[PDB]
Amino acid sequence: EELVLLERTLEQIIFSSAGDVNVYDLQALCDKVGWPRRPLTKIAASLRNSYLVATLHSVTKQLIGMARATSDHAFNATIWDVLVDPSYQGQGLGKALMEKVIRTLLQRDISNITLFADNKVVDFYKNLGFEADPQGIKGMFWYPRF
Amino acid sequence: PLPEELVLLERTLEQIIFSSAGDVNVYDLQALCDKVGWPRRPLTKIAASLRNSYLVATLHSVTKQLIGMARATSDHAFNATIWDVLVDPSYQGQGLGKALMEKVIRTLLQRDISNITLFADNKVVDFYKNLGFEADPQGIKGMFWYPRF
Numbered sequence: 142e143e144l145v146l147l148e149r150t151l152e153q154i155i156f157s158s159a160g161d162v163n164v165y166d167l168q169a170l171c172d173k174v175g176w177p178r179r180p181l182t183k184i185a186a187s188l189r190n191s192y193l194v195a196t197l198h199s200v201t202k203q204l205i206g207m208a209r210a211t212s213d214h215a216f217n218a219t220i221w222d223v224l225v226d227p228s229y230q231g232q233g234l235g236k237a238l239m240e241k242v243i244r245t246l247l248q249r250d251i252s253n254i255t256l257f258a259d260n261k262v263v264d265f266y267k268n269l270g271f272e273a274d275p276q277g278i279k280g281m282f283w284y285p286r287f
Numbered sequence: 288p289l290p291e292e293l294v295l296l297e298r299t300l301e302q303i304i305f306s307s308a309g310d311v312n313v314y315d316l317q318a319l320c321d322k323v324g325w326p327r328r329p330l331t332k333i334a335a336s337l338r339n340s341y342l343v344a345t346l347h348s349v350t351k352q353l354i355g356m357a358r359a360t361s362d363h364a365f366n367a368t369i370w371d372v373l374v375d376p377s378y379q380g381q382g383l384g385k386a387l388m389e390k391v392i393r394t395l396l397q398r399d400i401s402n403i404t405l406f407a408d409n410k411v412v413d414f415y416k417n418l419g420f421e422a423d424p425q426g427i428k429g430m431f432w433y434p435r436f
């Protein structure tokens with residue numbers, strides 16, 4: 142559940158599966174990457190209803206990474222909202238976070254791990270093993286507004 | 288407002304009721320899955336997936352026979368994903384799949400989930416395009432981790 146990813150010095154990055162994510166901290170994190178504000182009670186509703194909530198913390202605690210997944214607790218998991226503090230990207234942390242996400246889902250016996258990737262991020266997930274439109278399957282949205 | 292359960296159609300020589308009540312018997316479901324050719328899954332895990340599905344929607348043939356089902360997970364606020372849309376082959380081609388999906392979308396809209404998603408086999412993509420679903424908007428790709436299919 143908890144786990145020290147790395148340690149540096151001039152700081153240790155901790156990965157957790159607890160979901161101890163305070164919605165104010167996550168609102169800050171989201172703002173840094175330019176995601177639009179959303180009602181904290183709705184954010185909190187979506188975290189409370191996420192089968193998996195994974196976090197990166199930089200204890201010197203500061204939330205610097207998150208991923209989450211909805212699942213039907215049996216067959217299928219979908220990964221929404223993975224993000225790493227901009228001051229921390231390029232350090233291999235997005236990779237680490239995802240890698241424990243996939244492992245934790247595989248341990249809970251979810252064999253169908255899916256996501257929806259934006260154009261500029263598809264190649265980061267292809268590296269980790271994800272494969273777009275396998276055998277022609279297509280991901281579809283009802284009247285999107287992106 | 289769309290009620291929890293309602294009657295879609297009336298024919299004789301049988302009415303067809305939709306419901307989002309979610310009370311589907313895992314046995315009946317297992318048999319419907321057999322008909323469409325699906326391999327059988329462990330009942331306790333099917334039971335777990337229905338239990339953990341935000342929306343379970345049924346089509347029954349009163350005269351109760353399960354003839355249609357769709358389900359969706361969700362995070363209760365933002366996103367929803369529709370899995371296992373299926374209709375008994377004897378009742379396909381009647382507009383029942385179309386009817387079932389429209390109610391699913393409406394229910395998810397009423398609960399104010401605005402991001403409604405699914406993953407479509409190649410053969411069924413046009414079916415969902417008819418209903419307003421758009422594939423790969425803005426380059427977004429649906430991805431799977433090491434798919435075995």
Ligand SMILES: CC(=O)SCCNC(=O)CCNC(=O)[C@H](O)C(C)(C)COP(=O)(O)OP(=O)(O)OC[C@H]1O[C@@H](n2cnc3c(N)ncnc32)[C@H](O)[C@@H]1OP(=O)(O)O
Pocket residue numbers: 174220221222223224225226229230231232233234235236237256257258259261262264265268
């Ligand atoms: C969630 C969705 O549905 S879409 C994804 C949402 N994510 C976002 O775009 C929000 C902001 N993004 C981020 O937080 C980060 O850019 C992330 C999560 C995409 C990646 O974080 P980073 O820390 O930059 O990635 P990390 O440092 O772990 O790099 C991992 C590997 O992927 C590579 N990589 C990083 N970014 C990208 C990219 N945009 N495209 C391709 N490869 C990339 C890195 O080079 C590295 O490769 P290597 O291990 O082979 O050297």
Ligand SMILES: CC(=O)SCCNC(=O)CCNC(=O)[C@H](O)C(C)(C)COP(=O)(O)OP(=O)(O)OC[C@H]1O[C@@H](n2cnc3c(N)ncnc32)[C@H](O)[C@@H]1OP(=O)(O)O
Pocket residue numbers: 323369370371372373374375378379380381382383384385386405406407408410411412413414417
């Ligand atoms: C579940 C997923 O996420 S992927 C979908 C997986 N589903 C399956 O493979 C299970 C087996 N297949 C089925 O259950 C059925 O084919 C369904 C549910 C897809 C369709 O059910 P049906 O009752 O046959 O559909 P319905 O009668 O409502 O057909 C509606 C319309 O869509 C059209 N349509 C039906 N099947 C298809 C198809 N495969 N591709 C494109 N259009 C189709 C029909 O011709 C009909 O035309 P209309 O525009 O005149 O109405």
Ligand SMILES: COc1ccc2[nH]cc(CCN)c2c1
Pocket residue numbers: 221257258259365366402427
């Ligand atoms: C509503 O959540 C989703 C789902 C899929 C998505 N693809 C791209 C984005 C933009 C943010 N990278 C996004 C958001």
Ligand SMILES: COc1ccc2[nH]cc(CCN)c2c1
Pocket residue numbers: 253325371436
């Ligand atoms: C072949 O394994 C998988 C994986 C996910 C699936 N969803 C629905 C089905 C029935 C066939 N479409 C299915 C099968």
